[PDB]
Amino acid sequence: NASGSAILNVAKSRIGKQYMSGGTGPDLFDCSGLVLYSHNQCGVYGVPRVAKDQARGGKAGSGAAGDVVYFGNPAHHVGICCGDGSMVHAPRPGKTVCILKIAYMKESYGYRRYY
């Protein structure tokens, strides 16, 4: 899907940007801020601000490019699916935005779709 790929491309564009609690871009990100930025930049409105709400909004996803992957219920972490088992995410204070295999989180996860 083209909108999905667009959200992914915006997320990828932020690879290397520093983590900051409260960051939604363009230069500093928390996990849910990266998600929010990536959608907003593509005109995909309606995405909530924090991880726990992003996990509950939109519709069920499949893990295709641009879907939101969330971790836990209530969710404490999110990323943007690459569509290949990996995600773009803002990991934690002291890391930068990067790609990580979703399985490496070693915890419960699901997918939402906002496009």
Experimental technique used? X-ray
The domain total for the chain is 1
From 39, 42, 81, 89, the catalytic residue: 89
- For 103, other C-beta atoms within 10 Å of its C-beta total 10
Helix axes 2-13, 31-41, angle to 10 degrees: 130
DSSP the chain: -HHHHHHHHHHHHTTTPEE-TT-BSSSEE-HHHHHHHHHHHTT-----SSHHHHTTSSEE--S-TTPEEEEETTEEEEEEE-SSSEEEE--STT-BSEEEEGGGG-S-EEEEE--
Give the chain's radius of gyration (CA, Å).
Answer: 12
Domain membership of residue 24 as a residue range: 1-115
Q: Any catalytic annotation for residue 89?
A: yes
Q: What CA–CA distances, in Å, run from 17 to 11, 60, 105?
A: 10, 29, 20
CA–CA dist 33, 49 (Å, integer) = 7
Instruction: Tell me how many degrees the CA angle 55-10-111 measures, rounded to the nearest 5.
Output: 25
Would you state the structure tokens that stand for residue 68, as one six-digit string? 């939101």
* 76 catalytically annotated: no
Resolution in A: 1.6
19 bridge partner residues: 29
Tell me if residue 31 is catalytic.
yes
Candidate list 39, 42, 77, 81, residue with the active-site label = 77
